[PDB]
Design a protein around this ligand. Sequence first.
Ligand code: A5A
Lengths: 114, 115
Amino acid sequence: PGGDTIFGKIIRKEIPAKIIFEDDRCLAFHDISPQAPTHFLVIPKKHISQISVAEDDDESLLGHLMIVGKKCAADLGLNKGYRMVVNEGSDGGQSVYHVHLHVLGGRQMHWPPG
Amino acid sequence: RPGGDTIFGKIIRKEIPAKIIFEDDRCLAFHDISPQAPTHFLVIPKKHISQISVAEDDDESLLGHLMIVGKKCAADLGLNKGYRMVVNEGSDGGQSVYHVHLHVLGGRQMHWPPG
Ligand SMILES: C[C@H](N)C(=O)NS(=O)(=O)OC[C@H]1O[C@@H](n2cnc3c(N)ncnc32)[C@H](O)[C@@H]1O
């Protein structure tokens, strides 16, 4: 039912988050530890633990996260650009085992991306 | 032209060389010429879309397909300890090629923040 992580609790409305957008299949909310003046997450309501286990049937859902992300970025006034990030596993620095798309902007993002 | 005018269109049409990892009717995965990690490749759509900010609602499946291909290529390249996927948009994102693309980086510990 949204999974056994803190992101599951956020989806179920059991703990608060600053929600930017919601539909029947995803949720966008500001990150609690922001790394840029604007830093939010877009997550599926379906509990996919990590991108490495995403199924072929999840393709449109994953793309939906990116479309919602870019729409939210526009709504939040990120007209100079932004960066989207998905972390996988220990080397990727994945902090919660529920797939999440980071969207960061409001400052120059640098290279390399970590 | 199929693939667009950028250097990535040239790569799609085999007009300039690339080290290709995977190719299908919708996308192409190839190694980055300036790797920022021991493994660093790009997944790009064969349809030209300039940047994620102008992607259309009907591009959802294609965008998701980039991610699925990214994760499959990462597995095939033995990135078993993980990796980071990145899309750069515009000036603040550090985008230098205006053809939508997904970076996949691995083979070392990635740090936070992601730039
Ligand atoms: C460099 C800038 N920070 C950047 O990341 N720009 S980008 O988001 O648009 O990424 C484009 C990527 O395409 C790569 N690239 C450019 N020309 C290439 C070529 N002929 N073959 C393979 N990769 C190429 C660049 O090294 C860069 O990592």
